[PDB]
């Protein structure tokens, strides 16, 4: 079974319908959210809308490159936000689901 | 001074750049937010993205029709949510600003 295909049809598909997914479906808009230094602190922004476009448009060399984009999404969230913030609890729940889907591949 | 023009160039513009505006810039997406009764309770959904489109596309008969869309946006929020919810504090702050700009015509 092709792993990029699985990341698109299973992993992304599963994360996207999760009740905590909506803050991660598009780039963090630091201007609208009034987030100071977000772009100073987060040098490589990432989100599942960008990942979806990259899967649909042949961007990735391999599955590991797409997995590291998911991980960049999670770690950006942990780096910027304080532990126990709602957004961090949401990211952690999605990351657990992501790991479950990746471990079944 | 034409009131619809003022609603577009001053009132909407001022609310839109407010730090609490981003939840109101597009329709409430009840499936993504997991609000499984929103459309049963809210029969006339409204948001500032819809208002912007209506102002830009000649929808309104007059300024009172547009002001009632703003008011529908606020009252939808008060009807659906708990008093003291974050979204309600945000709507109330925007509504104060809206009233300030409307009172200054
Ligand atoms: C410009 C937004 S974005 O493009 O950047 N996306 C986005 C959104 C939230 C994000 O954080 C989520 C937590 O934020 C804290 C700010 O307090 C939240 C207070 O709000 C309550 C939710 O209210 C809405 C939000 C969006 C949307 N719209 S919608 O289309 O229906 C949604 C499906 C609608 C509502 C909403 C509107 N009404 C009128 C309602 O009656 C209502 C009733 C119940 C539930 C929701 C609503 C982030 C984000 C992502 N990451 C990775 C970060 O590290 C991060 C770090 C700091 C702050 C934010 C983030 C990104
Ligand atoms: Cl999807
Ligand atoms: Cl969960
Ligand atoms: Cl605008
Ligand atoms: Cl304020």
From Swiss-Prot, chains A, B:
It is found in: Nucleus; Chromosome. There is a cross-link at residue 40 (Glycyl lysine isopeptide (Lys-Gly) (interchain with G-Cter in SUMO2)). Changing residue 81 to A: Abolishes binding to acetylated histones. Phosphorylation by CK2 disrupt the intramolecular binding between the bromo domain 2 and the NPS region and promotes binding between the NPS and the BID regions, leading to activate the protein and promote binding to acetylated histones. In absence of phosphorylation, BRD4 does not localize to p53/TP53 target gene promoters, phosphorylation promoting recruitment to p53/TP53 target promoters. The record marks 81 as: Acetylated histone binding. Ubiquitously expressed. Chromatin reader protein that recognizes and binds acetylated histones and plays a key role in transmission of epigenetic memory across cell divisions and transcription regulation. Remains associated with acetylated chromatin throughout the entire cell cycle and provides epigenetic memory for postmitotic G1 gene transcription by preserving acetylated chromatin status and maintaining high-order chromatin structure. During interphase, plays a key role in regulating the transcription of signal-inducible genes by associating with the P-TEFb complex and recruiting it to promoters. Belongs to the BET family. It is linked to Cornelia de Lange syndrome 6: A form of Cornelia de Lange syndrome, a clinically heterogeneous developmental disorder associated with malformations affecting multiple systems. It is characterized by facial dysmorphisms, abnormal hands and feet, growth delay, cognitive retardation, hirsutism, gastroesophageal dysfunction and cardiac, ophthalmologic and genitourinary anomalies. CDLS6 inheritance is autosomal dominant. A chromosomal aberration involving BRD4 is found in a rare, aggressive, and lethal carcinoma arising in midline organs of young people. Translocation t(15;19)(q14;p13) with NUTM1 which produces a BRD4-NUTM1 fusion protein. JQ1, a thieno-triazolo-1,4-diazepine derivative, and I-BET, a benzodiazepine derivative, have been tested on tumors with success. Treatment with GSK1210151A (I-BET151, a I-BET derivative) has strong effets on mixed lineage leukemia and promotes myeloid differentiation and leukemia stem-cell depletion. This is Bromodomain-containing protein 4. It comes from Homo sapiens. The chain holds residues 60 to 164 of 1362 of the full protein.
């Amino acid at each position: 079974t092709n792993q990029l295909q699985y990341l698109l049809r299973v992993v992304l598909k599963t994360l996207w319908k999760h009740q905590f997914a909506w803050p991660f479906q598009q780039p963090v808009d630091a201007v609208k959210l009034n987030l100071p230094d977000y772009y100073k602190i987060i040098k490589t922004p990432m989100d599942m809308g960008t990942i979806k476009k990259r899967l649909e448009n042949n961007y990735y060399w391999n599955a590991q490159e797409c997995i590291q984009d998911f991980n960049t999404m999670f770690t950006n969230c942990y780096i910027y936000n304080k532990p126990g913030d709602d957004i961090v609890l949401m990211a952690e729940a999605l990351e657990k689901l992501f790991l479950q889907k990746i471990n079944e591949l």
